[PDB]
Amino acid sequence: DVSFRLSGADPSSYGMFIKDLRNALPHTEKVYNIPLLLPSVSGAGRYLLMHLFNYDGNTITVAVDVTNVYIMGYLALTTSYFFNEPAADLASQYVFRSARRKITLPYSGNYERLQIAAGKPREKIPIGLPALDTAISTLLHYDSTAAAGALLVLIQTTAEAARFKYIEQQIQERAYRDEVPSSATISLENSWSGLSKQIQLAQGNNGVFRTPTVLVDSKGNRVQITNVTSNVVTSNIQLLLNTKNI
Numbered sequence: 001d002v003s004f005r006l007s008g009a010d011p012s013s014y015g016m017f018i019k020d021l022r023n024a025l026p027h028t029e030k031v032y033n034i035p036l037l038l039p040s041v042s043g044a045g046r047y048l049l050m051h052l053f054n055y056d057g058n059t060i061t062v063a064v065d066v067t068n069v070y071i072m073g074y075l076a077l078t079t080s081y082f083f084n085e086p087a088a089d090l091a092s093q094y095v096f097r098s099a100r101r102k103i104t105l106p107y108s109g110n111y112e113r114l115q116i117a118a119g120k121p122r123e124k125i126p127i128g129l130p131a132l133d134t135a136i137s138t139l140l141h142y143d144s145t146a147a148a149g150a151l152l153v154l155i156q157t158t159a160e161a162a163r164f165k166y167i168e169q170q171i172q173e174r175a176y177r178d179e180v181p182s183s184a185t186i187s188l189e190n191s192w193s194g195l196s197k198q199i200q201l202a203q204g205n206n207g208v209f210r211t212p213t214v215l216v217d218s219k220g221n222r223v224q225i226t227n228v229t230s231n232v233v234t235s236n237i238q239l240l241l242n243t244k245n246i
């Protein structure tokens with residue numbers, strides 16, 4: 001299981017935690033040198049548990065589906081919380097079984113629903129390590145509205161970071177000062193599926209995308225991705241959603 005402690009955390013250890021997180025996700029083949037996530041995994045092995053310690057030392061353990069990196073729920077002391085969706089439902093059958101009581105949140109785990117519950121788009125939610133420390137603290141003491149925003153932070157400083165090196169770096173820059181994500185970061189988070197798909201469909205198409213993926217670069221400019229030589233593919237994306245799950 002992968003751990004990360006916010007006390008004494010700096011860009012280096014966060015990077016190491018994020019590396020650990022990538023290493024914990026199983027894969028058989030690589031596509032254009034990028035680990036390909038399994039189509040499916042049966043049993044409790046389908047879930048990865050992240051122990052997260054906030055600055056004061058308090059911890060929550062988060063359950064992640066290793067086939068897509070989606071957070072399914074988490075455990076705070078003796079209570080367990082899972083999103084209101086089938087996947088998480090299934091997941092609750094394998095993790096945090098010993099929790100003295102289980103709560104299901106009033107929303108599913110997709111950004112659309114979390115932004116509603118939180119009452120604000122993630123474009124306006126500062127992220128960073130300090131922000132992660134808050135999020136961890138927030139989830140310990142239940143408040144579905146607060147948790148929604150906390151989860152939007154956790155998902156991005158965790159899952160999205162593992163998936164994209166750019167995002168990992170965005171977080172390292174925000175190690176001592178939170179800042180809303182650049183729209184490039186949002187652009188990526190929303191293109192993971194499309195990119196995972198087009199990168200796989202390129203395997204038999206000479207590394208050329210059947211359909212190009214439109215993103216926004218760091219300068220804020222609209223940009224098209226047509227082939228695996230792009231830096232997005234050669235340098236950025238670190239994991240790929242298996243096309244079986246698309």
Ligand SMILES: *[C@@H]1O[C@H](CO)[C@@H](O)[C@H](O)[C@H]1NC(C)=O
Binds near residue numbers: 226227229230231
């Ligand atoms: C592929 O993408 C590269 C990098 O963005 C770009 O310079 C080039 O025009 C593209 N080439 C082809 C054949 O699509």
Ligand SMILES: O=c1[nH]cc(F)c(=O)[nH]1
Binds near residue numbers: 110111155
């Ligand atoms: O829409 C989503 N994207 C990525 C995630 F990890 C998630 O839970 N929801």
